[PDB]
């Protein structure tokens, strides 16, 4: 069972996580009408610019984050930004919608402009997340755990990050035993999903440059976070 300190930590992580754009806001736009690859690339860059901004504010509220080395603070943000974006997309994808809606959303994403090469692994990851039947708290804690990964490249003080990640891992493990007591492998399955997240980060720049558009225009903020322009 969670302690008073863990219950406090969980609600605080939840409130900060809830400051994001609503899944319905995103799915309403995609489902409403079909767009060209040019319009979809523009929708994606704006969605991703908003995501980075909201992620920086979420990251700042993570306990102990502001006490870390400033250069390590940047390495953590640069290292998790794309993974956090794909995890959020996976959450929105697996949110329950009326009959036939999730079939149309999938078809709309498949024909967004992205090359077929990246479509299959992206939907494989999304569908694997859905099979886990994750609660909102599980997605929030997993995002926090992704940001506070000490095994990130360029990190100077790995132990300082470890100290921050460990209490979040403990809370998630307790929720996994409470939410799914019939599946004792649930916690391990979520941690396993983080390795698949890292593959999308390796092919992120190619996914964007292979989009079916004549010009790949990026915002100055996206140029800092993504390895583009």
């Amino acid at each position: 069972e969670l302690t008073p300190d863990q219950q406090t930590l969980l609600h605080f992580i939840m409130d900060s996580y809830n400051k994001q754009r609503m899944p319905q806001e995103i799915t309403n736009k995609i489902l409403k009408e079909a767009f060209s690859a040019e319009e979809n690339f523009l929708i994606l860059t704006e969605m991703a610019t908003n995501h980075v901004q909201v992620l920086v504010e979420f990251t700042k509220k993570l306990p102990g984050f502001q006490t870390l080395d400033h250069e390590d603070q940047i390495a953590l943000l640069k290292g998790s930004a794309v993974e956090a974006m794909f995890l959020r997309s996976a959450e929105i994808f697996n949110k329950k919608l009326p009959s036939g809606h999730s079939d149309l959303l999938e078809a709309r994403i498949r024909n967004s402009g992205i090359s077929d090469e990246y479509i299959t692994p992206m939907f494989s990851f999304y569908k694997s997340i859905g099979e886990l039947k994750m609660t909102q708290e599980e997605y929030a804690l997993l995002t926090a755990i992704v940001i506070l990964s000490p095994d990130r490249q360029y990190i100077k003080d790995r132990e300082a990050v470890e100290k921050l990640q460990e209490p979040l891992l403990d809370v998630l493990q307790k929720l996994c035993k409470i939410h799914q007591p019939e599946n004792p492998q649930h916690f391990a399955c979520l941690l396993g999903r983080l390795t698949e997240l890292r593959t999308f980060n390796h092919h992120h720049a190619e996914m964007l440059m292979s989009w079916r558009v004549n010009d790949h225009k990026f915002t100055p903020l996206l140029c800092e976070i993504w390895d583009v322009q």
């Binding site: 400033h70 940047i74 943000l77 800092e224």
Partner: peptide, 11 residues
């Protein structure tokens, strides 16, 4: 990364 630095250092 001056934009990220700005977003982290701002109150």
């Amino acid at each position: 990364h001056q934009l990220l630095r700005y977003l982290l250092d701002k109150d």
